[PDB]
Amino acid sequence: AGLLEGVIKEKGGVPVYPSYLAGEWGGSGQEIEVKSPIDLATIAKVISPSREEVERTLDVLFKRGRWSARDMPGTERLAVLRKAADIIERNLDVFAEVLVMNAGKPKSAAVGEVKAAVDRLRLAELDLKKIGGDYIPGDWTYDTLETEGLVRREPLGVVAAITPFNYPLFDAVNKITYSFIYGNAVVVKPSISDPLPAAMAVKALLDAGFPPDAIALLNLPGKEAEKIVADDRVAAVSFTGSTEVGERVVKVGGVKQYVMELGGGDPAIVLEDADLDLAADKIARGIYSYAGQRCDAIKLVLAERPVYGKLVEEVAKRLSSLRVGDPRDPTVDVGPLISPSAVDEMMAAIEDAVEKGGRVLAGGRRLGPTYVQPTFVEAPADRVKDMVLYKREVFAPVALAVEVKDLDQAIELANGRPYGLDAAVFGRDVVKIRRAVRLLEVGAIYINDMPRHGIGYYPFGGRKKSGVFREGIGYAVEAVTAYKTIVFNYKGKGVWKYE
Amino acid sequence: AGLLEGVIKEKGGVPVYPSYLAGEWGGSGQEIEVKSPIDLATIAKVISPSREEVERTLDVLFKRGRWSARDMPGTERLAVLRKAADIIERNLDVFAEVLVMNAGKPKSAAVGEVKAAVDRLRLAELDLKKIGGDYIPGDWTYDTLETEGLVRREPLGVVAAITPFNYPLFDAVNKITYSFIYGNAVVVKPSISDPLPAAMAVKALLDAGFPPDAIALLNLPGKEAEKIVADDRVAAVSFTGSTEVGERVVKVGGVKQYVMELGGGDPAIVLEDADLDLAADKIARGIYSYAGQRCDAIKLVLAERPVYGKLVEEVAKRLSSLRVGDPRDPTVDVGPLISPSAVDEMMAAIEDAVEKGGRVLAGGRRLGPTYVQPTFVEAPADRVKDMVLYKREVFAPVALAVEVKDLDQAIELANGRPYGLDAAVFGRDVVKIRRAVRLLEVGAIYINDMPRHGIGYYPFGGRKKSGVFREGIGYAVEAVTAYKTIVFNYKGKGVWKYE
Amino acid sequence: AGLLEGVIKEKGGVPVYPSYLAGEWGGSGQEIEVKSPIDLATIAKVISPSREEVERTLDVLFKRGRWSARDMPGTERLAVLRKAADIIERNLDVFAEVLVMNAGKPKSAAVGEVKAAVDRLRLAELDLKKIGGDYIPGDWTYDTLETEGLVRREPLGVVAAITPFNYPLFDAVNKITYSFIYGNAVVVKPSISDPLPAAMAVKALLDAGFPPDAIALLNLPGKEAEKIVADDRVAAVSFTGSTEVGERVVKVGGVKQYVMELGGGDPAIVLEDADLDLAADKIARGIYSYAGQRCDAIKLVLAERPVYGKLVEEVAKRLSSLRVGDPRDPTVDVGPLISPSAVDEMMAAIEDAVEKGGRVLAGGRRLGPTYVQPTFVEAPADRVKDMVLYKREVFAPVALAVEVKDLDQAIELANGRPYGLDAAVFGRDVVKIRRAVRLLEVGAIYINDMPRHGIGYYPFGGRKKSGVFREGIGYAVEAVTAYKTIVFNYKGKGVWKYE
Amino acid sequence: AGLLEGVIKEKGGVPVYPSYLAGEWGGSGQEIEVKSPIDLATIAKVISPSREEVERTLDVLFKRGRWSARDMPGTERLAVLRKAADIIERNLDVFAEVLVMNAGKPKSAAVGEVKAAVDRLRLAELDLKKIGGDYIPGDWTYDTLETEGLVRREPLGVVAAITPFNYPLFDAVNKITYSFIYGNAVVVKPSISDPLPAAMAVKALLDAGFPPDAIALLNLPGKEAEKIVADDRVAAVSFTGSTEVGERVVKVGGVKQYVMELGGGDPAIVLEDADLDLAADKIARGIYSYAGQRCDAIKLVLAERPVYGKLVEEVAKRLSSLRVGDPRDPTVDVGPLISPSAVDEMMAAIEDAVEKGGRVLAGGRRLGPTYVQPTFVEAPADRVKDMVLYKREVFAPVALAVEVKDLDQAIELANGRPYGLDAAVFGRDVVKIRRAVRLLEVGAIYINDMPRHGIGYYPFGGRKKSGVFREGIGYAVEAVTAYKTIVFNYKGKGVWKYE
Ligand SMILES: NC(=O)c1ccc[n+]([C@@H]2O[C@H](COP(=O)([O-])OP(=O)(O)OC[C@H]3O[C@@H](n4cnc5c(N)ncnc54)[C@H](O)[C@@H]3O)[C@@H](O)[C@H]2O)c1
Ligand code: NA
Ligand code: NA
Ligand code: NA
Ligand code: NA
């Protein structure tokens, strides 16, 4: 359609999407089927590049793309991004439909993601708040007298952006945006599960003027991407995905600059003075949004004795009164999970919790190979820590509810999971809140709201098993830029007179 | 002596230095002999910890040290560091003698290093220029209206500091200083080649009040240290050493925060308008200081046609008029190289250059198993790139001299090595200098001076094979600290009236 | 026309422009004739407000405008500014024609100013690089332990923007932009000499959505404006104009936040190694642009012995080969000066220089009541300091040329004027340049270019008689914003455990 | 004694303190008697300088001191300040005794001030967090392409520090410290009421190595100081004192850089959820400390209906159980007010409140010409606004207590005074606190503590009648430093390739 007009190869009934090889759309490696979780049907195919095409693409990115991106002044890069935003925006419905179909995303969620992608592109100028360099006077030390330094940021070169299946459009646009804005060339490697949105975004950027040899989109399955991560021409790896793959990526990449957003779930804590209506609403939402397939989804709810009853009651009502089905209905609240495998795991995990003293408070019923009801499992503090739902991230709409004596116990249980992405705290007392802020070991804490990374207006990232470094408007500069120091020596040259 | 009074075990004629196990000096693993490069004699032994002692130490650092360091307010950490500086300073001669003996460092160089270590400790307060956090208003986006965020730094926890043999005292004090100042516990792992200075520095810090369970000094040989790097309780690895080991470290560590200073040599460029007296002096020095065993040692000299003759002549005179011998003589200029193996490599490399069209302009003579003359090898631009001296870092006092047509050719040859730590440029024209600053792919550029990292008053670090990230007063905060974001939600709470 | 359709009162043959009274266009004070310097003819009239209307307007700005501006979120303020930019841009020719007619600005200069105004409005988002606040941890002092502070910027309230005649459009848009972007209401008071462009800009902002009660445009002659400056409801005064008026403004205003851009001329220094073609061109331009009616116009040229001859020769050729006349001709280079009075002063000053040993090298001829030739007067170093052209700012296209022995003498003569706005330095030696940078007492130094403030991409402002504080994208935040500190006390509350 | 050994002229029974004239202690103007508020007796005399000595001193400061301060590298300035701290510290008792005697300060308060002065001097290195400059890339605008700028701070030159009577030692050391640390020369003008401590501090700095011609201490009565403020050689005026004098200072000084800390009192608000024990204690203290002669003293207490009774009861008990008398007794809590005149005003003001419906809840009794009891006057919200105690700052230990319906009314009453220095808020609800933070128009807000500027670890300053700009460690740099911009032009020079 319009955008991918001459790109998509209509062959054998299903549209065939090629990879973009830093100059031309193409590919001559195995073709791979892309399915919809809505009906397990094949909706398209993508052409992966061969080994020689990967090698040739990296060579173009390194030898030419680095310079095309860097030698395009920032004023023009910004124009490129603002124009790409316009193109995506006018093709909004088309972008959204693919998200609904390829990712099983409910209509309102698909529309929200496209819009986040557009805003991210349009606010590229706010990323400049952290682009200026430093001027360091030398007279504060005897050894540096009559000396001085300039510290400025420089693009690293080629950034490999590896994206997860759950934000197939936004994650790719976000990484491309902060990488390009600072002068880098970029290699995008989307989940082979739903690579269509990224293909569309990359086409819009190319139409907008993005230097043709400074970007690549390689539809490669997981382990074939290792080839890219391990290459010396790739100076940085921005990876968003699971902990286990993140580990593999670093061990394969070796010394390089990395940003690792490794998810895991998020705990929510409700203090006795919390507005329970606000909390119940925000928590229910954090649990089921996009069928819990959000890195920042609430997986554990801790509530102090006096509000626990009401709170868990309201959240249960809110969850069971939800409509599950095909994501196309603007009436549906929850669509399918990405694969039948994901549902299998959620069910096995719910059973595990029950066998260990847990009781289902809402949901619990599987509705098909990829459909399930958002579940809320109550569990006694003394047994919760051994439950699979606590010890692991079950990427589905399921959370545990645990009653706690006080803030200290809530903090301890929240910190007991191996992850540390975000945490949410509902309450009003400034002291209790300040204590929780200090002691919760996570990259971000949301006071009186559900965790929501949005477009990264506020930086976010993990602690512990949730990764390292941050993404965010401005802050992402640390991940795809290197400092360059220039020290000038004027010793005895008469600039200063002993100072 | 005084400092390590009850610590050193005088047994079997040679002093035996134990490891510090986050509470008590000890160790029950193999004992290892420490030799002096001055005479290849055994001057001490160090006790490495057993597997159980490594495990127990990490456990203490993680469970107790994190909190002892963090729960000691900054005002007190600063007092600890200022007191440790006083102790090292009054034991200056003793610290220097060990450097001379254990590292083969010339007296003036040993004294300089001790003093750099003292200054680094005393200037810990300048590290606070980058400790403050950010306050982000939320009204610049519609989605964040009536919201706002705080971004503050937090210690990561346990930092593993792995140090090289050539700055055995300073590197250990530098890493301990920037790690502790931000609230982290630290595990120090010095080169097993010359671990004595670090043992002494750690003792001075402990005497100064450094939280006893927040530091460890493990005398472990290279590959036994892997155990520490790979442990999940180690949240950061500050590594200074060679490229090849740096790579191994990351592949073993996996996802973690890293600073990798991987050295390599540095090229020096002399423009036609350069003060040749200043240049000849600075370049000779950059070539031979500490027998070229400096990451920032000059390994390649590029000089434009019109000054090449004079320049290389003066540098040759300066180099051959140097006195080599035992580092104790305040008269000696160059002491021994750390091992006979290192000299073997320098000789093999000089031969390689000769066989490939190179001509020795100064030095070239080996004077013993660990002694050699600082060598200056001239080479034609058309053959230099294939020489071992160009393609690799030969950690010894040896550099190549290459005549070039112009700045473009100089820049191209400087960038042809696989490293990118620093570069030096001598000249006066602002345009040529600005061009070189932009195009030299290195972490730092020194205008009209030899590259010298000093105490990191100006940040430094590598590009390409020279590593990632920076160290420096203030800038090191990015390597041992993680951001924590706190987002407050006041939507509809009446703080703002639509804004 | 289009923009000021229902605003302009076509009465008595000449268009009558009313003042904008924070809600409605109007005015009932004396009417004042506005003339064109091109033909001394009346081209319009402006209605000044009466004393009661000034009082009522300030009251509206204080009681309502402060809140309308502040309570409009930044995301919307930005939209208002981007839309105002679009409106000005599509009315470009109309804006330019008024500049040509009302200010006597050459066509290319008028177009440049309109465009600068449009860019300034569109880049309002870059002003956010300095809008974030600070988060100060309290453990670095014993007295502040268990305490912490937040420092954030807040609008001051009502900013009075007083503008000069020479950048009638840009200065007004610049001040309105940085004042509004941070949440302030604004009172604009343009030169009564050429207030038409400001009236048009304010109308475009109002059409774009600028909160109607948060802005005012008062066509008041100089001393009647004092009433506004002295009012307690005006929290800040952004004044661009002459030194003498600036002084009066502060003495009338009393304690308030001020930015004073008080001009004066600028000296240019040419080192012996300078590209004389670049220098001669840039200097000629700095001397005659807009008939020298630029605060940053070059009024003194200092050139080292060896290049002096050539340099002054080339600049003289360039100046006398200029075409003076009506600014409408896209062929004319120099239009008229703002008033016959200004020309009188330039002639008297040129005579003074001649009587004191000076010799005219180019120009010197008056061509009419408001027209003159750009003049270049040579003068011996030993007598220049007593010349009116040196001691004062003669706001016309006239500069002195003085030969100097060396950089020290050039710096001394440049610093001998009572002003210190900018200075220009042409040359290539990094040491000489660095010395001049340190010792020239001015707000800004331009290396190898003529001084040009542009839209303030780089901050600018004066030293000495040239004023205080800076304007510039981002930096202007200090002039119309106040810090607010919030200190939180958690002493003994268990957040920290002695830290 | 020791410090002022050869300086003090013991003549006619009373010690005679000379002024310091930027080189030598001396003075030949009228002698002025200095009295103690403890017994109204003459305890010393100070020699004011004649008109010629003021003129000569300014000339030395301008021509020589600017350069002596600036040409002393920062590393040395820091040493000077650390040594001055040591000297003051070992003369602690002597410094304290003079404060007790000359200012009537209770012993514990006098000791606290000396210590604050010592800490301020020792933490001068923390002021460097805001000393670095900026490096601005030019490719973000088409007009600035191939251009770039450096922005760095520069000392303004001579700073005139005018200090109030209530912090005679600290204010002088604070201003001297932040002025000198950035490279400025300083003229100190203390209250002629208690100039002894400043004389002692200046002597300690001179003994510590402070450039002899870069500092001056002029014992001049109020209006004779105008001569200094109005001089063009004084580039900045740091003034701490009353509103009315501050206004005079600016009107006399004209265009200059100013910091005006103009005091006024501070309101305290107690929310219904506040810890009343903490609040009652902190508020009582804020009311009586140094007999209310603190710019940040609490002058108005607003308490919500439900806690008002208890709160005002506890504060009343705490206030009447205080011991008034000679400040020497380490038992006394409140010493005398600075002059009988000050007590007269407090009594007249208390009467005014009573006549207007107010009722005394504690104190109210005058105990002598300079002694009074700290008074707490209750007042109905409907009549408080017309009371002298509300409308003005009565510099004495007296505050009003007003019961309020809710936070909105508290905020409105707090904002009704003409001042806006600080405010205090006691409570725990994050929303109410956030609202108060936004709407209280003051320079600083203290949550759950009494307002205390301390040594300026957190910046402080006023809004409204309380002045402009801030003082504080780091932030004071904006008041005594000017930016200098250097723009480099490389257009067409081949540094960048269109970028
Ligand atoms: N805002 C703050 O941070 C702060 C701090 C401490 C004190 N204060 C305020 O200062 C006042 C108490 O001090 P004070 O009574 O000595 O007040 P003040 O205003 O009389 O002090 C003025 C200082 O300025 C000098 N001075 C007086 N007239 C002058 C003139 N015409 N020209 C130049 N200099 C002149 C005085 O000798 C004295 O040194 C109170 O109002 C208090 O709130 C404010
Ligand atoms: Na690698
Ligand atoms: Na790992
Ligand atoms: Na005033
Ligand atoms: Na003045």
Coordinates of N, CA, C and O in Angstrom, one line a residue, chain D residues 4 7-9 15-22 24-34 44-51 53-55 57-58 61 98 102 161-164 168 172 176 186-203 215-228:
Chain D
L4 N 44.8 40.5 65.6 CA 44.9 41.9 65.3 C 45.9 42.7 66.2 O 45.8 43.8 66.5
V7 N 47.6 45.7 64.6 CA 46.6 46.5 63.9 C 45.8 47.5 64.8 O 45.7 48.7 64.5
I8 N 45.2 46.9 65.8 CA 44.4 47.6 66.8 C 45.2 48.7 67.5 O 46.3 48.4 68.1
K9 N 44.8 49.9 67.5 CA 45.4 51.1 68.2 C 44.8 51.2 69.5 O 43.6 51.7 69.6
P15 N 39.9 50.1 72.4 CA 40.6 49.7 71.2 C 40.0 50.3 69.9 O 38.8 50.5 69.7
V16 N 40.9 50.8 69.1 CA 40.6 51.5 67.9 C 40.9 50.7 66.6 O 42.1 50.4 66.3
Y17 N 39.9 50.2 65.9 CA 40.1 49.3 64.7 C 40.2 50.2 63.4 O 39.2 50.9 63.1
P18 N 41.3 50.1 62.7 CA 41.4 50.8 61.5 C 40.7 50.1 60.3 O 40.3 48.9 60.4
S19 N 40.5 50.8 59.2 CA 40.0 50.2 58.0 C 41.1 49.6 57.2 O 42.3 50.0 57.5
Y20 N 40.9 48.6 56.4 CA 42.0 48.0 55.6 C 41.9 48.6 54.2 O 40.8 48.4 53.5
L21 N 42.9 49.3 53.8 CA 42.9 50.0 52.5 C 43.6 49.4 51.3 O 44.4 50.0 50.6
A22 N 43.4 48.1 51.1 CA 44.0 47.3 50.0 C 45.5 47.5 49.9 O 46.0 47.8 48.9
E24 N 47.4 48.3 53.2 CA 47.7 48.6 54.6 C 46.5 49.0 55.5 O 45.5 49.6 55.0
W25 N 46.5 48.6 56.8 CA 45.5 49.0 57.7 C 45.7 50.5 58.0 O 46.9 50.9 58.1
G26 N 44.7 51.3 58.1 CA 44.8 52.7 58.3 C 43.5 53.4 58.3 O 42.5 52.8 58.7
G27 N 43.5 54.6 57.9 CA 42.3 55.4 57.9 C 42.6 56.8 58.5 O 43.3 56.9 59.5
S28 N 42.0 57.8 58.0 CA 42.2 59.2 58.6 C 40.9 60.0 58.5 O 40.9 61.2 58.5
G29 N 39.8 59.3 58.5 CA 38.5 59.9 58.5 C 37.9 59.9 59.9 O 38.7 59.4 60.8
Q30 N 36.7 60.3 60.2 CA 36.1 60.3 61.5 C 36.2 59.0 62.2 O 36.2 57.9 61.5
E31 N 36.4 59.0 63.5 CA 36.4 57.8 64.3 C 35.0 57.5 64.7 O 34.3 58.5 65.0
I32 N 34.6 56.3 64.8 CA 33.2 56.0 65.2 C 33.1 55.0 66.3 O 33.8 54.0 66.2
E33 N 32.3 55.3 67.3 CA 32.2 54.4 68.4 C 31.3 53.2 68.1 O 30.3 53.3 67.5
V34 N 31.7 52.0 68.6 CA 31.0 50.8 68.4 C 30.5 50.4 69.8 O 31.2 50.3 70.7
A44 N 34.6 49.7 71.5 CA 35.7 49.9 70.5 C 35.4 51.1 69.7 O 34.3 51.6 69.8
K45 N 36.3 51.5 68.8 CA 36.0 52.5 67.8 C 36.6 52.0 66.5 O 37.5 51.2 66.5
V46 N 36.1 52.5 65.4 CA 36.6 52.1 64.1 C 37.0 53.4 63.4 O 36.3 54.4 63.5
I47 N 38.0 53.3 62.6 CA 38.4 54.5 61.8 C 37.9 54.4 60.4 O 38.2 53.4 59.7
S48 N 37.1 55.4 60.0 CA 36.5 55.3 58.7 C 37.6 56.0 57.8 O 38.4 56.8 58.2
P49 N 37.6 55.7 56.5 CA 38.6 56.3 55.6 C 38.0 57.6 55.1 O 36.8 57.8 55.0
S50 N 38.9 58.5 54.7 CA 38.5 59.8 54.2 C 38.1 59.6 52.7 O 38.3 58.5 52.2
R51 N 37.6 60.7 52.1 CA 37.2 60.6 50.7 C 38.3 60.2 49.8 O 38.2 59.4 48.9
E53 N 40.9 58.5 50.6 CA 41.4 57.1 50.9 C 40.4 56.1 50.2 O 40.8 55.0 49.9
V54 N 39.1 56.5 50.1 CA 38.2 55.6 49.5 C 38.5 55.6 48.0 O 38.6 54.5 47.4
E55 N 38.8 56.8 47.4 CA 39.2 56.9 46.0 C 40.4 56.1 45.7 O 40.5 55.4 44.7
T57 N 41.7 53.6 47.4 CA 41.5 52.2 47.6 C 40.8 51.6 46.4 O 41.2 50.5 45.9
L58 N 39.8 52.3 45.9 CA 39.1 51.8 44.7 C 40.0 51.7 43.5 O 40.0 50.7 42.8
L61 N 42.2 48.6 44.0 CA 41.4 47.4 43.8 C 41.2 47.2 42.3 O 41.4 46.1 41.8
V98 N 33.7 38.1 70.6 CA 33.3 39.4 69.9 C 31.9 39.4 69.4 O 31.2 40.4 69.4
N102 N 29.8 42.2 70.6 CA 29.4 43.2 69.6 C 28.0 43.1 69.1 O 27.4 44.1 68.8
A161 N 30.9 44.1 48.6 CA 30.0 43.3 49.5 C 29.5 44.2 50.6 O 30.3 44.6 51.4
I162 N 28.2 44.4 50.7 CA 27.6 45.2 51.8 C 26.9 44.3 52.7 O 26.0 43.5 52.2
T163 N 27.2 44.3 53.9 CA 26.7 43.3 54.9 C 25.8 43.9 56.0 O 25.9 45.1 56.3
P164 N 24.8 43.1 56.5 CA 23.9 43.6 57.6 C 24.5 43.3 59.0 O 25.5 42.7 59.2
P168 N 27.2 39.5 61.1 CA 28.4 40.3 60.9 C 29.6 39.5 60.5 O 30.5 40.1 59.8
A172 N 30.0 38.4 55.8 CA 31.2 38.9 55.2 C 32.1 37.8 54.6 O 32.7 38.0 53.6
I176 N 32.9 37.2 50.6 CA 34.3 37.3 50.2 C 34.7 35.9 49.5 O 35.5 35.9 48.6
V186 N 37.6 42.3 46.1 CA 36.5 42.6 46.9 C 36.6 43.8 47.9 O 37.6 43.9 48.5
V187 N 35.5 44.6 47.9 CA 35.5 45.7 48.9 C 34.4 45.4 49.9 O 33.3 45.1 49.4
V188 N 34.7 45.2 51.1 CA 33.8 44.9 52.2 C 33.3 46.1 52.9 O 34.1 46.9 53.3
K189 N 32.0 46.2 53.1 CA 31.5 47.3 53.8 C 30.5 46.8 54.8 O 29.3 46.5 54.5
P190 N 30.9 46.5 56.1 CA 30.1 46.0 57.1 C 29.2 47.0 57.8 O 29.3 48.2 57.6
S191 N 28.2 46.5 58.6 CA 27.3 47.4 59.3 C 28.3 48.2 60.2 O 29.1 47.5 60.8
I192 N 28.1 49.5 60.3 CA 29.0 50.2 61.2 C 28.6 49.9 62.7 O 29.3 50.3 63.6
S193 N 27.5 49.2 62.8 CA 27.0 48.8 64.1 C 27.9 47.7 64.8 O 28.1 47.7 66.0
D194 N 28.3 46.7 64.0 CA 29.2 45.6 64.5 C 30.2 45.2 63.5 O 30.1 44.0 63.0
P195 N 31.1 46.0 63.1 CA 32.2 45.8 62.1 C 33.4 45.1 62.6 O 34.3 44.8 61.8
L196 N 33.5 44.8 63.9 CA 34.6 44.1 64.5 C 34.9 42.7 63.9 O 36.0 42.3 63.6
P197 N 33.9 41.8 63.8 CA 34.1 40.5 63.3 C 34.6 40.5 61.9 O 35.5 39.6 61.6
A198 N 34.2 41.4 61.1 CA 34.6 41.4 59.7 C 36.1 41.8 59.7 O 36.9 41.3 58.9
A199 N 36.5 42.8 60.5 CA 37.9 43.2 60.6 C 38.7 42.0 60.9 O 39.7 41.8 60.3
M200 N 38.3 41.2 61.9 CA 39.0 40.0 62.3 C 39.1 38.9 61.2 O 40.1 38.3 61.0
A201 N 38.0 38.8 60.4 CA 38.0 37.8 59.3 C 38.9 38.2 58.2 O 39.7 37.4 57.7
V202 N 38.9 39.5 57.9 CA 39.7 40.0 56.8 C 41.2 39.9 57.2 O 42.1 39.6 56.4
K203 N 41.5 40.1 58.5 CA 42.9 39.9 59.0 C 43.3 38.5 58.8 O 44.5 38.2 58.4
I215 N 41.7 43.1 48.4 CA 40.7 43.2 49.4 C 40.7 44.6 50.1 O 41.8 45.2 50.3
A216 N 39.6 45.0 50.6 CA 39.5 46.3 51.3 C 38.3 46.1 52.3 O 37.4 45.4 52.0
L217 N 38.5 46.8 53.4 CA 37.5 46.7 54.5 C 37.3 48.2 54.9 O 38.1 48.8 55.5
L218 N 36.1 48.8 54.5 CA 35.9 50.2 54.7 C 34.8 50.4 55.8 O 33.6 50.1 55.5
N219 N 35.2 50.9 56.9 CA 34.2 51.1 58.0 C 33.6 52.5 57.7 O 34.1 53.5 58.2
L220 N 32.6 52.5 56.9 CA 31.9 53.7 56.6 C 30.4 53.6 56.9 O 29.8 52.5 56.8
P221 N 29.8 54.7 57.4 CA 28.4 54.6 57.8 C 27.6 54.5 56.5 O 28.1 54.9 55.4
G222 N 26.4 54.0 56.6 CA 25.5 53.8 55.5 C 25.7 54.7 54.3 O 26.2 54.3 53.3
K223 N 25.1 55.9 54.3 CA 25.2 56.8 53.2 C 26.5 57.2 52.6 O 26.6 57.8 51.6
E224 N 27.6 57.0 53.4 CA 28.9 57.3 52.9 C 29.4 56.2 52.0 O 30.4 56.4 51.2
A225 N 28.8 55.1 52.1 CA 29.1 53.9 51.3 C 28.6 54.1 49.8 O 29.2 53.5 48.9
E226 N 27.6 54.9 49.7 CA 27.0 55.2 48.4 C 28.1 55.5 47.3 O 28.0 55.1 46.2
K227 N 29.1 56.2 47.8 CA 30.2 56.6 47.0 C 30.8 55.4 46.3 O 31.2 55.4 45.1
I228 N 30.9 54.3 47.0 CA 31.5 53.0 46.4 C 30.5 52.3 45.4 O 30.9 51.9 44.4

